[PDB]
Design an enzyme around this catalytic site. Structure first.
Site, PDB file in Angstrom:
ATOM      1  N   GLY A  43      -4.242 -11.726   7.929  1.00 40.25           N
ATOM      2  CA  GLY A  43      -3.252 -12.189   8.883  1.00 40.25           C
ATOM      3  C   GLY A  43      -3.617 -11.780  10.289  1.00 40.25           C
ATOM      4  N   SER A  44      -2.661 -11.902  11.212  1.00 41.52           N
ATOM      5  CA  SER A  44      -2.870 -11.560  12.622  1.00 41.52           C
ATOM      6  C   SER A  44      -3.401 -10.139  12.795  1.00 41.52           C
ATOM      7  CB  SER A  44      -1.569 -11.714  13.411  1.00 41.52           C
ATOM      8  OG  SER A  44      -0.859 -12.874  13.015  1.00 41.52           O
ATOM      9  N   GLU A  47      -7.430  -7.710   8.024  1.00 39.56           N
ATOM     10  CA  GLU A  47      -7.715  -7.993   6.629  1.00 39.56           C
ATOM     11  C   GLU A  47      -7.554  -6.778   5.734  1.00 39.56           C
ATOM     12  OE1 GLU A  47     -11.351  -9.026   8.389  1.00 39.56           O
ATOM     13  OE2 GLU A  47     -11.548 -10.839   7.144  1.00 39.56           O
ATOM     14  N   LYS A  63      -7.788  -1.633   4.819  1.00 41.03           N
ATOM     15  CA  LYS A  63      -7.322  -2.512   5.885  1.00 41.03           C
ATOM     16  C   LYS A  63      -8.222  -2.359   7.109  1.00 41.03           C
ATOM     17  CE  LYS A  63      -3.350  -1.828   8.092  1.00 41.03           C
ATOM     18  NZ  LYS A  63      -2.864  -2.057   9.466  1.00 41.03           N
ATOM     19  N   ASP A 157      10.425  -1.351   7.365  1.00 42.34           N
ATOM     20  CA  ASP A 157       9.809  -2.548   6.834  1.00 42.34           C
ATOM     21  C   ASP A 157       9.886  -2.533   5.317  1.00 42.34           C
ATOM     22  OD1 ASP A 157       8.561  -4.999   7.347  1.00 42.34           O
ATOM     23  OD2 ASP A 157       6.540  -4.154   7.218  1.00 42.34           O
ATOM     24  N   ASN A 162       5.777  -4.803   0.600  1.00 39.42           N
ATOM     25  CA  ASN A 162       5.399  -3.423   0.901  1.00 39.42           C
ATOM     26  C   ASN A 162       5.709  -2.452  -0.251  1.00 39.42           C
ATOM     27  OD1 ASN A 162       4.544  -4.425   3.291  1.00 39.42           O
ATOM     28  ND2 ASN A 162       6.207  -3.643   4.586  1.00 39.42           N
ATOM     29  N   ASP A 175       2.744   0.876   3.205  1.00 39.80           N
ATOM     30  CA  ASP A 175       2.632   0.157   4.478  1.00 39.80           C
ATOM     31  C   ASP A 175       3.496   0.651   5.612  1.00 39.80           C
ATOM     32  OD1 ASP A 175       2.084  -1.506   6.543  1.00 39.80           O
ATOM     33  OD2 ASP A 175       2.213  -3.335   5.431  1.00 39.80           O
ATOM     34  N   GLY A 177       3.429   0.861   8.757  1.00 39.57           N
ATOM     35  CA  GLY A 177       3.067   0.375  10.056  1.00 39.57           C
ATOM     36  C   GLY A 177       4.143   0.492  11.090  1.00 39.57           C
TER      37      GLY A 177
HETATM   38  C1  LIG Z   1      -3.397  -6.639  -7.187  1.00 44.27           C
HETATM   39  C2  LIG Z   1      -3.145  -5.429  -6.272  1.00 44.27           C
HETATM   40  O1  LIG Z   1      -2.962  -6.015  -4.973  1.00 44.27           O
HETATM   41  C3  LIG Z   1      -2.729  -5.179  -3.918  1.00 44.27           C
HETATM   42  C4  LIG Z   1      -2.805  -3.783  -4.101  1.00 44.27           C
HETATM   43  C5  LIG Z   1      -2.559  -2.914  -3.021  1.00 44.27           C
HETATM   44  N1  LIG Z   1      -2.635  -1.576  -3.218  1.00 44.27           N
HETATM   45  C6  LIG Z   1      -2.395  -0.705  -2.193  1.00 44.27           C
HETATM   46  C7  LIG Z   1      -2.075  -1.152  -0.880  1.00 44.27           C
HETATM   47  C8  LIG Z   1      -1.864  -0.181  -0.010  1.00 44.27           C
HETATM   48  N2  LIG Z   1      -1.687   0.673   0.748  1.00 44.27           N
HETATM   49  C9  LIG Z   1      -1.988  -2.556  -0.611  1.00 44.27           C
HETATM   50  N3  LIG Z   1      -1.715  -3.074   0.678  1.00 44.27           N
HETATM   51  C10 LIG Z   1      -2.070  -2.418   1.861  1.00 44.27           C
HETATM   52  C11 LIG Z   1      -1.153  -2.419   2.948  1.00 44.27           C
HETATM   53  C12 LIG Z   1      -1.433  -1.727   4.147  1.00 44.27           C
HETATM   54  C13 LIG Z   1      -2.630  -1.002   4.291  1.00 44.27           C
HETATM   55  F1  LIG Z   1      -2.884  -0.349   5.392  1.00 44.27           F
HETATM   56  C14 LIG Z   1      -3.560  -0.974   3.243  1.00 44.27           C
HETATM   57 CL1  LIG Z   1      -4.995  -0.089   3.454  1.00 44.27          CL
HETATM   58  C15 LIG Z   1      -3.283  -1.675   2.041  1.00 44.27           C
HETATM   59  C16 LIG Z   1      -2.244  -3.433  -1.727  1.00 44.27           C
HETATM   60  C17 LIG Z   1      -2.188  -4.834  -1.586  1.00 44.27           C
HETATM   61  C18 LIG Z   1      -2.418  -5.722  -2.655  1.00 44.27           C
HETATM   62  N4  LIG Z   1      -2.350  -7.083  -2.504  1.00 44.27           N
HETATM   63  C19 LIG Z   1      -1.627  -7.808  -1.597  1.00 44.27           C
HETATM   64  O2  LIG Z   1      -1.393  -7.357  -0.451  1.00 44.27           O
HETATM   65  C20 LIG Z   1      -1.157  -9.069  -1.938  1.00 44.27           C
HETATM   66  C21 LIG Z   1      -0.800 -10.000  -1.032  1.00 44.27           C
HETATM   67  C22 LIG Z   1      -0.305 -11.318  -1.408  1.00 44.27           C
HETATM   68  N5  LIG Z   1      -0.317 -12.307  -0.275  1.00 44.27           N
HETATM   69  C23 LIG Z   1       1.023 -12.457   0.371  1.00 44.27           C
HETATM   70  C24 LIG Z   1      -1.419 -12.108   0.723  1.00 44.27           C
END
Ligand SMILES: CCOc1cc2ncc(C#N)c(Nc3ccc(F)c(Cl)c3)c2cc1NC(=O)/C=C/CN(C)C
Length: 285
Positions: A43-44, A47, A63, A157, A162, A175, A177
């Site tokens: 997103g913005s 990744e 991230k 949030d 999250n 998350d 943030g």
């Molecule tokens: C199958 C498992 O999928 C995930 C597992 C996760 N484990 C830990 C963290 C954490 N922490 C995650 N997100 C994340 C947040 C913010 C941060 F800064 C960092 Cl480093 C990591 C995760 C995200 C996942 N998957 C998704 O985000 C899915 C999105 C669906 N769509 C709307 C795009």
């Protein structure tokens, strides 16, 4: 030109190293110290990748911000996510931060890998989750919240995207943030949250731990009733006047409906705290 550790425990930002990482080669620490497996989200902001470390062989999420720091404030703002995550510390219902670093103006946050977000899990099942699951997620996330609130932290949030599934029906709040530490005004402070989950008093700039309770309230409502939350308009207003919409609230047991009414109390002064919720009979083993 070289990766430098971002932390607020110690002052001196230090350079990283890793088996696999030879500073001589051109590739970044990320490229070179990790095995990029797939993209979890984007997103913005930038990744998120599912990655395997070439240091320990373990899986993590990483991230990565989208473009190099625009200026001193932009840097301090992004770096503050790390400070936020560190203030939370270790807790079984909070996502654990492994480490974070900066290289070439790009910030990297490396967390433990959890299971799917609650958002994905609901989306995959395509229906209201069974009440027994809801109670477990409601309870894990309240435990996370009470841990934050006890330290003057407000997540700001709370939402299914999250909240991340863990083994045997548990979950973790992550998350940080937009997390803020109460009593400290800035800065920059209180970046804007998703309006679908916004406590009503936030509209007029009234911030407190009570905001999170209300967000979890709509969060539990959404997953419990397979309901999409309104961005604005009359529909947004209807959820914030105390009562519950009777359409999709039908299936809720008396106990769940009771607890959701406590959490959705429009007046932050009168809204149940997470501690109080966790001391209700229905919410302890
Ligand atoms: C199958 C498992 O999928 C995930 C597992 C996760 N484990 C830990 C963290 C954490 N922490 C995650 N997100 C994340 C947040 C913010 C941060 F800064 C960092 Cl480093 C990591 C995760 C995200 C996942 N998957 C998704 O985000 C899915 C999105 C669906 N769509 C709307 C795009």
């Amino acid at each position: 030109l070289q990766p430098r550790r971002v932390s607020f425990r110690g002052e001196a930002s230090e350079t990283l190293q890793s088996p696999g990482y030879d500073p001589s080669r051109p590739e970044s620490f990320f490229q070179q110290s990790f095995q990029r497996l797939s993209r979890l989200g984007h997103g913005s902001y930038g990744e998120v990748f599912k990655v395997r470390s070439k240091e320990d062989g373990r899986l993590y999420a990483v991230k990565r911000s989208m473009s190099p720091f625009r200026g001193p404030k932009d840097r301090a703002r992004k770096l503050a996510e790390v400070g936020s995550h560190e203030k939370v510390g270790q807790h079984p219902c909070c996502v654990r931060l492994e480490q974070a670093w900066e290289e070439g103006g790009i910030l990297y946050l490396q967390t433990e890998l959890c299971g799917p977000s609650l958002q994905q899990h609901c989306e995959a099942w395509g229906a209201s989750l069974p009440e027994a699951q809801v109670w477990g997620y409601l309870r894990d996330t309240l435990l996370a919240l009470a841990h934050l609130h006890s330290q003057g932290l407000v997540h700001l949030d709370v939402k299914p995207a999250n909240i991340f599934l863990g083994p045997r029906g548990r979950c973790k709040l992550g998350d940080f943030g937009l997390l803020v530490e109460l009593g400290t005004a800035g800065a920059g402070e209180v970046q804007e949250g998703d309006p679908r989950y916004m406590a009503p008093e936030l509209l007029q700039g009234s911030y407190g731990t009570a905001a999170d309770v209300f967000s979890l309230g709509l969060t539990i409502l959404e997953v419990a009733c397979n309901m999409e939350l309104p961005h604005g308009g009359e529909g947004w207003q209807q959820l914030r006047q105390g009562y519950l919409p009777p359409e999709f609230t039908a299936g809720l047991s008396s106990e769940l409906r009771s607890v959701l009414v406590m959490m959705l109390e429009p007046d932050p002064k009168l809204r149940a705290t997470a501690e109080a919720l966790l001391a209700l009979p229905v919410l302890r083993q």
